[PDB]
Amino acid sequence: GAMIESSTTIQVISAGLPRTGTKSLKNALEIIYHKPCYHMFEIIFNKQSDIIKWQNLIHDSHMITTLTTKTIAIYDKLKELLDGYIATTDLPTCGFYKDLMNIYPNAKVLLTIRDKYDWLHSLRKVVLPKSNDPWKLKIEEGDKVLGLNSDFYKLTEDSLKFAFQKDDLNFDDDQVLLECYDEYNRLVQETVPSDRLLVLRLGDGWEPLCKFLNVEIPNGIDYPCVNSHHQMTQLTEQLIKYKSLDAIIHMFPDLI
């Protein structure tokens, strides 16, 4: 097809929870739009200074009215954080999908989903290990190497609570997490008009996404398949071994 000049503003809002193919989608959207897409990896690797800003936003967000003046101050902060990006995925953004829809009325919405038990397994291996899991200690050691500490974990927890609309949450309780997952995904599909929503199951690939976005399928490029828990386990172990990201970054070309 013809090449057109795309606007550098949020065009795609992905409401999918972590461990549902968000990093592959981030990569896919960057392949399509040639501009950056937000993801937790953008925070970890490029903008750790954004952590406190996301924290402050989540703190003030109860004050959001489904526009009031308190709402506008928050919406302005959201726009500031996302300036220069063409899409959002992953925590901490995903819980804000409804607000992002108001801020970017011409953006389309995605929902990434998968088998709930596969999701929980993946989540426990990477994002939210049980407190008694020895692996949690390795994750914390690798996080230290990346310069992530208690503030990062607070952002992860608070943004999960915000997405699930819980004031507190037993993170070690599998049943609680699975119920929140199902209710979260159900609410997105109830909230977003079907014409503005595309639901993507893990493995769906380029075709329905490119159709929804009115773009050609990228020539000769496979749909990304990155960020498996096995790959993150390798990353964690290599970070612990070398004590730096930059010593090993070349060994993870598309993941980071």
Ligand X SMILES: Nc1ncnc2c1ncn2[C@@H]1O[C@H](COP(=O)(O)O)[C@@H](OP(=O)(O)O)[C@H]1O
Ligand Y SMILES: CC(C)NC[C@@H]1CCc2cc(CO)c([N+](=O)[O-])cc2N1
Which entry of ligand Y, ligand X, none binds 177, CB below 5 to 8 A by partner kind? Answer: none
Residue closest to 226 by CA, chosen among 85, 41, 15, 86: 41
Which entry of ligand X, ligand Y, none binds 129, CB below 5 to 8 A by partner kind? Answer: none
Which entry of ligand Y, ligand X, none binds 142, CB below 5 to 8 A by partner kind? Answer: ligand Y
Q: Which residue is nearest to ligand Y (CB)?
A: 142
Which entry of ligand X, ligand Y, none binds 91, CB below 5 to 8 A by partner kind? Answer: ligand Y
The string over 222-239, giving b where at least 16 C-beta atoms fall within 10 Å of a residue's C-beta and e elsewhere, is ebbebbbeebbbebbebb
From 72-80, 172-180, 228-236, 248-256, span contacting ligand Y (CB under 6 A):
228-236
DSSP string, 123-138: HHHHT---TT-THHHH
Q: Check residue 236 for interaction with ligand Y (CB under 6 A).
A: yes
User: Nearest distance from residue 126's CB to ligand X, in Å?
Assistant: 7
Residue closest to 212 by CA, chosen among 79, 29, 31: 29
Q: Check residue 86 for interaction with ligand Y (CB under 6 A).
A: no
64 Cβ contact partners less than 8 Å away, ≥ 6 residues apart: 70, 71, 74, 99
Whether the CB-CB separation of 145 and 244 falls below 8 Å is answered with yes
State which residue, 147 or 203, has the beta carbon closest to ligand X.
Answer: 203
Whether the CB-CB separation of 123 and 18 falls below 8 Å is answered with yes
Which residues lie near ligand X (CB under 6 A)? 18-24, 118, 122, 202-203, 223, 225, 227-229
Q: Check residue 91 for interaction with ligand Y (CB under 6 A).
A: yes
For residue 249, the tally of other CB atoms under 10 A from its CB is 14
For binding to ligand Y (CB under 6 A), which residues are involved? 18, 22, 40, 90-91, 126-127, 139, 142-143, 156, 232, 235-236, 239
